[PDB]
Scaffold this active site. Structure first.
Site, PDB file in Angstrom:
ATOM      1  N   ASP A  16      69.192   4.534  49.229  1.00 28.50           N
ATOM      2  CA  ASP A  16      70.151   4.965  48.238  1.00 28.50           C
ATOM      3  C   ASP A  16      69.438   5.890  47.220  1.00 28.50           C
ATOM      4  O   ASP A  16      68.311   5.585  46.848  1.00 28.50           O
ATOM      5  CB  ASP A  16      70.696   3.697  47.608  1.00 28.50           C
ATOM      6  CG  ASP A  16      71.924   3.960  46.733  1.00 28.50           C
ATOM      7  OD1 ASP A  16      72.459   5.085  46.882  1.00 28.50           O
ATOM      8  OD2 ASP A  16      72.320   3.052  45.949  1.00 28.50           O
ATOM      9  N   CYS A  35      78.780   5.890  52.732  1.00 28.70           N
ATOM     10  CA  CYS A  35      77.541   5.212  52.386  1.00 28.70           C
ATOM     11  C   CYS A  35      78.055   4.076  51.494  1.00 28.70           C
ATOM     12  O   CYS A  35      78.990   3.369  51.878  1.00 28.70           O
ATOM     13  CB  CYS A  35      76.516   6.136  51.709  1.00 28.70           C
ATOM     14  SG  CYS A  35      77.337   7.327  50.634  1.00 28.70           S
ATOM     15  N   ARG A  51      74.758  10.090  50.000  1.00 29.07           N
ATOM     16  CA  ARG A  51      74.223  10.101  51.361  1.00 29.07           C
ATOM     17  C   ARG A  51      75.338  10.751  52.214  1.00 29.07           C
ATOM     18  O   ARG A  51      75.053  11.691  52.999  1.00 29.07           O
ATOM     19  CB  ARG A  51      73.764   8.715  51.852  1.00 29.07           C
ATOM     20  CG  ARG A  51      72.511   8.237  51.088  1.00 29.07           C
ATOM     21  CD  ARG A  51      72.146   6.791  51.337  1.00 29.07           C
ATOM     22  NE  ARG A  51      73.014   5.902  50.577  1.00 29.07           N
ATOM     23  CZ  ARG A  51      72.926   4.578  50.638  1.00 29.07           C
ATOM     24  NH1 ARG A  51      71.996   4.011  51.412  1.00 29.07           N
ATOM     25  NH2 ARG A  51      73.733   3.821  49.893  1.00 29.07           N
ATOM     26  N   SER A  52      76.586  10.273  52.054  1.00 30.14           N
ATOM     27  CA  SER A  52      77.732  10.977  52.650  1.00 30.14           C
ATOM     28  C   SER A  52      77.844  12.508  52.449  1.00 30.14           C
ATOM     29  O   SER A  52      78.075  13.218  53.453  1.00 30.14           O
ATOM     30  CB  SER A  52      79.068  10.274  52.327  1.00 30.14           C
ATOM     31  OG  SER A  52      78.865   8.906  52.651  1.00 30.14           O
ATOM     32  N   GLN A  99      73.758  13.476  45.411  1.00 31.78           N
ATOM     33  CA  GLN A  99      73.612  12.751  44.155  1.00 31.78           C
ATOM     34  C   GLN A  99      72.268  12.981  43.452  1.00 31.78           C
ATOM     35  O   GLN A  99      72.092  12.504  42.342  1.00 31.78           O
ATOM     36  CB  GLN A  99      73.807  11.252  44.453  1.00 31.78           C
ATOM     37  CG  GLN A  99      75.283  10.797  44.451  1.00 31.78           C
ATOM     38  CD  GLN A  99      75.805  10.785  43.026  1.00 31.78           C
ATOM     39  OE1 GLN A  99      75.340   9.977  42.225  1.00 31.78           O
ATOM     40  NE2 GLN A  99      76.724  11.713  42.691  1.00 31.78           N
TER      41      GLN A  99
HETATM   42  C1  LIG Z   1      75.217   3.436  45.087  1.00 33.32           C
HETATM   43  N1  LIG Z   1      75.812   4.689  44.530  1.00 33.32           N
HETATM   44  N2  LIG Z   1      76.290   4.788  43.227  1.00 33.32           N
HETATM   45  C2  LIG Z   1      76.753   6.046  42.998  1.00 33.32           C
HETATM   46  C3  LIG Z   1      77.354   6.430  41.697  1.00 33.32           C
HETATM   47  C4  LIG Z   1      77.389   7.670  41.064  1.00 33.32           C
HETATM   48  C5  LIG Z   1      78.049   7.817  39.837  1.00 33.32           C
HETATM   49  C6  LIG Z   1      78.675   6.695  39.296  1.00 33.32           C
HETATM   50  C7  LIG Z   1      78.674   5.451  39.949  1.00 33.32           C
HETATM   51  C8  LIG Z   1      78.015   5.319  41.167  1.00 33.32           C
HETATM   52  C9  LIG Z   1      76.608   6.809  44.138  1.00 33.32           C
HETATM   53  C10 LIG Z   1      76.013   5.905  45.011  1.00 33.32           C
HETATM   54  N3  LIG Z   1      75.596   5.966  46.309  1.00 33.32           N
HETATM   55  S1  LIG Z   1      75.577   6.792  47.579  1.00 33.32           S
HETATM   56  O1  LIG Z   1      76.805   7.581  47.396  1.00 33.32           O
HETATM   57  O2  LIG Z   1      75.986   5.531  48.240  1.00 33.32           O
HETATM   58  O3  LIG Z   1      74.362   7.333  48.224  1.00 33.32           O
HETATM   59 CL   LIG Z   2      68.190   1.544  49.293  1.00 29.54          CL
HETATM   60 CL   LIG Z   3      77.179  14.604  40.648  1.00 33.61          CL
END
Ligand SMILES: Cn1nc(-c2ccccc2)cc1NS(=O)(=O)O
Ligand SMILES: [Cl-]
Ligand SMILES: [Cl-]
Ligand SMILES: [Cl-]
Ligand SMILES: [Cl-]
Ligand SMILES: [Cl-]
Ligand SMILES: [Mg+2]
Length: 297
Positions: free
Chosen positions: A180, A214, A220-221, A261
């Site tokens: 992550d 993800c 990751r998506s 991200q």
């Molecule tokens: C675990 N997580 N949390 C975020 C995020 C970003 C902004 C606000 C809250 C959560 C994105 C992600 N993960 S990911 O999209 O799963 O790689």
């Molecule tokens: Cl992880």
């Molecule tokens: Cl962003």
């Protein structure tokens, strides 16, 4: 041109600045449905919502809300559904969406538990003999077979509409070693996995959009969809120079917030597209080399 730009950003040390400008330029559209009080338990993250214009609507009846977006790439001619990792109370809705949207493949880029926390419900059966019945949405789901590699697993599932008795085969591609807010271990390991997905037929326009998730369905998506779309775009055209990666990412972000991200996921995207362009442009041998470098056995 992506490689020259890559070298320049790397030289001046400016990935953070490049990536922050993408964030400042990204679309801001409403998500009023996602925010309805009745939908609160349907959302994993307060701040990660599908835009209303692009959200996938379930064909109930009572509440059509799922935290899922259709990223429809007009020029590439490929769509993807990006979604959060399903919650204990949304696994039936997730399979409902896969059924209604006629998806043939689900790409899962996360683990159920990451960093000590539960980041996705166990939404698919881990044993042939213990199927899942989603009574709410009238679906049953059966593990048919799995192929377990060192860093990813391919599973064949059978989805059944209990109402009609129609059955479909769903391929599950599970990347288990992408941290992550992290990057894959190498471009090779990522590209080897991406081309396993492509090889399956699951991205064919004869099928609904592949589901990509993800945990939040954005970092990751977004990294996955970006690299794929860019490779498709240069394949169409047979022209690597015609692909503007940051523009493609901005186009995607019209459809779902927050795609990619970190600055390093952006930088990784360019590495993956630059390396995958070798394949697109006629060097079929690199595919075998990615498989080796990935250490999948
Ligand atoms: C675990 N997580 N949390 C975020 C995020 C970003 C902004 C606000 C809250 C959560 C994105 C992600 N993960 S990911 O999209 O799963 O790689
Ligand atoms: Cl992880
Ligand atoms: Cl962003
Ligand atoms: Cl897992
Ligand atoms: Cl852990
Ligand atoms: Cl969960
Ligand atoms: Mg067994």
């Amino acid at each position: 041109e992506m490689e020259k730009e890559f070298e320049q950003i790397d030289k001046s040390g400016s990935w953070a600045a490049i990536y922050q400008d993408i964030r400042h330029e990204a679309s801001d559209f409403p998500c009023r449905v996602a925010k309805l009080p009745k939908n609160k338990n349907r959302n994993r993250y307060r701040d990660v919502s599908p835009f209303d214009h692009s959200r996938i609507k379930l064909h109930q009846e009572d509440n059509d809300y799922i935290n899922a977006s259709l990223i429809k790439m007009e020029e590439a001619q490929r769509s993807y559904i990006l979604t959060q990792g399903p919650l204990p109370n949304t696994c039936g809705h997730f399979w409902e969406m896969v059924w209604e949207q006629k998806s043939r493949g689900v790409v899962m880029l996360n683990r159920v538990m990451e960093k000590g926390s539960l980041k996705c419900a166990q939404y698919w059966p881990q044993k042939e003999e213990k199927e899942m019945i989603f009574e709410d949405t009238n679906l049953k789901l059966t593990l048919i077979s799995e192929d377990i590699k060192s860093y990813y697993t391919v599973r064949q599932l059978e989805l059944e509409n209990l109402t009609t008795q129609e059955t479909r085969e769903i391929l599950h591609f599970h990347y288990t070693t992408w941290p992550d807010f992290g990057v894959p271990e190498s471009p090779a390991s990522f590209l080897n996995f991406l081309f396993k997905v492509r090889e399956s037929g699951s991205l064919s326009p004869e099928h609904g959009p592949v589901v990509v998730h993800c945990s939040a369905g954005i970092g990751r998506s977004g990294t996955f969809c970006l690299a794929d779309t860019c490779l498709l775009l240069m394949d169409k055209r047979k022209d690597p120079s015609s692909v503007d990666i940051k523009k493609v990412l901005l186009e995607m972000r019209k459809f779902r917030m927050g795609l990619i991200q970190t600055a390093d996921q952006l930088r990784f995207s360019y590495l993956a597209v630059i390396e995958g362009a070798k394949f697109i442009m006629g060097d079929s041998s690199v595919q075998d080399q990615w498989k080796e470098l990935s250490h999948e056995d």
